[PDB]
mmCIF file of all heavy atoms in Angstrom:
data_model
loop_
_atom_site.group_PDB
_atom_site.id
_atom_site.type_symbol
_atom_site.label_atom_id
_atom_site.label_comp_id
_atom_site.label_asym_id
_atom_site.label_seq_id
_atom_site.Cartn_x
_atom_site.Cartn_y
_atom_site.Cartn_z
ATOM 1 N N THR B 84 80.235 104.011 98.220
ATOM 2 C CA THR B 84 80.316 104.924 97.113
ATOM 3 C C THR B 84 79.099 104.662 96.193
ATOM 4 O O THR B 84 78.574 103.551 96.175
ATOM 5 C CB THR B 84 81.643 104.807 96.293
ATOM 6 O OG1 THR B 84 81.654 103.594 95.512
ATOM 7 C CG2 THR B 84 82.843 104.863 97.164
ATOM 8 N N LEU B 85 78.683 105.692 95.533
ATOM 9 C CA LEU B 85 77.638 105.618 94.523
ATOM 10 C C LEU B 85 77.626 104.263 93.870
ATOM 11 O O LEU B 85 76.628 103.566 93.910
ATOM 12 C CB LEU B 85 77.809 106.675 93.467
ATOM 13 C CG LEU B 85 76.761 107.772 93.293
ATOM 14 C CD1 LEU B 85 75.903 107.989 94.559
ATOM 15 C CD2 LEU B 85 77.374 109.109 92.797
ATOM 16 N N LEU B 86 78.782 103.848 93.364
ATOM 17 C CA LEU B 86 78.939 102.549 92.656
ATOM 18 C C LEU B 86 78.301 101.351 93.359
ATOM 19 O O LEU B 86 77.707 100.527 92.685
ATOM 20 C CB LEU B 86 80.408 102.246 92.421
ATOM 21 C CG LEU B 86 81.022 102.956 91.243
ATOM 22 C CD1 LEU B 86 82.413 103.574 91.495
ATOM 23 C CD2 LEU B 86 81.006 102.076 89.984
ATOM 24 N N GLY B 87 78.379 101.328 94.679
ATOM 25 C CA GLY B 87 77.919 100.145 95.404
ATOM 26 C C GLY B 87 76.412 100.057 95.696
ATOM 27 O O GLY B 87 75.985 99.105 96.329
ATOM 28 N N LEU B 88 75.672 101.062 95.227
ATOM 29 C CA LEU B 88 74.270 101.228 95.629
ATOM 30 C C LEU B 88 73.325 100.147 95.100
ATOM 31 O O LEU B 88 72.490 99.660 95.892
ATOM 32 C CB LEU B 88 73.779 102.625 95.313
ATOM 33 C CG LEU B 88 72.529 103.068 96.064
ATOM 34 C CD1 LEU B 88 72.702 102.753 97.559
ATOM 35 C CD2 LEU B 88 72.277 104.538 95.862
ATOM 36 N N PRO B 89 73.373 99.833 93.800
ATOM 37 C CA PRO B 89 72.533 98.757 93.273
ATOM 38 C C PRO B 89 72.801 97.454 94.002
ATOM 39 O O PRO B 89 71.871 96.735 94.397
ATOM 40 C CB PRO B 89 72.927 98.677 91.827
ATOM 41 C CG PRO B 89 74.264 99.279 91.703
ATOM 42 C CD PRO B 89 74.264 100.356 92.733
ATOM 43 N N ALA B 90 74.078 97.184 94.184
ATOM 44 C CA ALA B 90 74.530 95.958 94.862
ATOM 45 C C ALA B 90 73.829 95.860 96.214
ATOM 46 O O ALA B 90 73.263 94.768 96.545
ATOM 47 C CB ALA B 90 76.027 96.040 95.071
ATOM 48 N N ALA B 91 73.793 96.914 96.976
ATOM 49 C CA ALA B 91 73.168 96.914 98.318
ATOM 50 C C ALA B 91 71.637 96.823 98.234
ATOM 51 O O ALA B 91 71.037 95.884 98.792
ATOM 52 C CB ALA B 91 73.623 98.117 99.098
ATOM 53 N N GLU B 92 71.017 97.795 97.607
ATOM 54 C CA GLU B 92 69.552 97.801 97.380
ATOM 55 C C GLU B 92 69.019 96.439 97.140
ATOM 56 O O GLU B 92 68.051 96.043 97.826
ATOM 57 C CB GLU B 92 69.211 98.616 96.089
ATOM 58 C CG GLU B 92 69.111 100.122 96.294
ATOM 59 C CD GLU B 92 68.842 100.855 94.976
ATOM 60 O OE1 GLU B 92 68.192 100.277 94.079
ATOM 61 O OE2 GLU B 92 69.305 101.990 94.835
ATOM 62 N N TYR B 93 69.596 95.717 96.220
ATOM 63 C CA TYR B 93 69.198 94.365 95.869
ATOM 64 C C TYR B 93 69.304 93.392 97.016
ATOM 65 O O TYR B 93 68.351 92.725 97.376
ATOM 66 C CB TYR B 93 70.011 93.862 94.651
ATOM 67 C CG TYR B 93 69.817 92.362 94.343
ATOM 68 C CD1 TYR B 93 68.528 91.806 94.308
ATOM 69 C CD2 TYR B 93 70.919 91.538 94.101
ATOM 70 C CE1 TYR B 93 68.357 90.422 94.024
ATOM 71 C CE2 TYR B 93 70.752 90.200 93.820
ATOM 72 C CZ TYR B 93 69.484 89.658 93.764
ATOM 73 O OH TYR B 93 69.297 88.303 93.486
ATOM 74 N N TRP B 94 70.566 93.261 97.560
ATOM 75 C CA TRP B 94 70.805 92.282 98.612
ATOM 76 C C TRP B 94 69.898 92.493 99.806
ATOM 77 O O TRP B 94 69.311 91.517 100.325
ATOM 78 C CB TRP B 94 72.273 92.342 99.056
ATOM 79 C CG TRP B 94 73.247 91.972 97.998
ATOM 80 C CD1 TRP B 94 73.000 91.184 96.869
ATOM 81 C CD2 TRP B 94 74.616 92.352 97.881
ATOM 82 N NE1 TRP B 94 74.156 91.048 96.106
ATOM 83 C CE2 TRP B 94 75.137 91.757 96.709
ATOM 84 C CE3 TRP B 94 75.427 93.123 98.714
ATOM 85 C CZ2 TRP B 94 76.478 91.964 96.355
ATOM 86 C CZ3 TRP B 94 76.781 93.275 98.345
ATOM 87 C CH2 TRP B 94 77.272 92.727 97.180
ATOM 88 N N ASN B 95 69.730 93.723 100.250
ATOM 89 C CA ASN B 95 68.869 94.069 101.420
ATOM 90 C C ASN B 95 67.444 93.617 101.239
ATOM 91 O O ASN B 95 66.779 93.276 102.198
ATOM 92 C CB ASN B 95 68.994 95.530 101.742
ATOM 93 C CG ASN B 95 70.356 95.973 102.273
ATOM 94 O OD1 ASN B 95 70.732 95.621 103.389
ATOM 95 N ND2 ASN B 95 71.077 96.760 101.479
ATOM 96 N N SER B 96 66.983 93.662 99.987
ATOM 97 C CA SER B 96 65.638 93.151 99.676
ATOM 98 C C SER B 96 65.563 91.618 99.847
ATOM 99 O O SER B 96 64.567 91.125 100.424
ATOM 100 C CB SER B 96 65.225 93.566 98.259
ATOM 101 O OG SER B 96 66.075 92.975 97.267
#
Side-chain angles (χ1 to χ4, degrees):
Chain B
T84 73
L85 244 23
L86 280 136
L88 200 47
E92 276 177 31
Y93 170 48
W94 297 335
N95 292 290
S96 62

